């Protein structure tokens, strides 16, 4: 019975952790993909910053709208953990070398394991991230999407199954790069430095995330990029390199907020239950 309750309570912890940081997350998504919104006509004028995004979004839509799409983040836990509880340890020993043998082999092992497991999860999961991004992106001025199922329906009707999986490759590569830089920077520096490593890894692997999400944005529209590389080149050529880093600061804010609320809830969990879930 221990596993069922552990699964449910882990679900609760993750749900609260993500829900608490949901507004700044949606702000991140809005600032990141604003140009696509401008092309689609969803947005009127570009966001001046985080504060401006907060003010405009709150004024036009309201307070609860800051949690738009969060349901996907809440549901996403269950299939993710189910696949990880079943395959992650198996995949780790599949590509894994002992750290005592060598570092060049072990590191590659981590890259392969993380990449394969991440891709395997995204094979079932990516739809929810897509729906999350799209639901966070469409803003009332008449909303583009009515809900989650509406996103699924209309995306399938317009683009098919391909539309649900926009930016899969740069997401996998993004996971690999983020992982490698995380473990590299962390092992090079050897509990505050962990947040520094996370911030660095997220910031350095951020352009791939931007490309991914904007590729998600191109879904359903008449015009789309000819791949992740074409997307990257077009973005850099049209808006500049810095445009690849839109929403990165808000992402960091999301990181510190998430850290805060997960710490607090972990303490409450400590008081109530013997151990954290
Ligand atoms: C291109 C990018 C940027 C860089 C890579 C990813 C993540 C950071 C990649 C990150 O990827 C996580 O990286 C962690 C640190 O190595 C790793 O932890 S560890 O194994 O214990 O070491 C997690 O593996 S897991 O098996 O425990 O669960 C892994 O999550 C997944 O593999 C779940 C997949 C469904 C993604 C997950 C995630 C996160 O912010 O945490 C998430 O899905 O929320 C991504 C956000 C989106 C981007 C941002 C993707 O757009």
From Swiss-Prot:
The matrix-open state (m-state) is inhibited by the membrane-permeable bongkrekic acid (BKA). The cytoplasmic-open state (c-state) is inhibited by the membrane-impermeable toxic inhibitor carboxyatractyloside (CATR). GO terms for cellular component: mitochondrial inner membrane; mitochondrion. Residues 212-217 are annotated as: Important for transport activity. It is found in: Mitochondrion inner membrane. It catalyses: ADP(in) + ATP(out) = ADP(out) + ATP(in). The chain crosses the membrane at residues 3-30, 71-95, 103-123, 168-189, 191-208, 248-268. A motif (Nucleotide carrier signature motif) lies at residues 212-217. The keyword Ligase does not apply. Belongs to the mitochondrial carrier (TC 2.A.29) family. This is ADP,ATP carrier protein 3. It comes from Saccharomyces cerevisiae (strain ATCC 204508 / S288c) (Baker's yeast). The lineage of its organism: Eukaryota, Fungi, Dikarya, Ascomycota, Saccharomycotina.
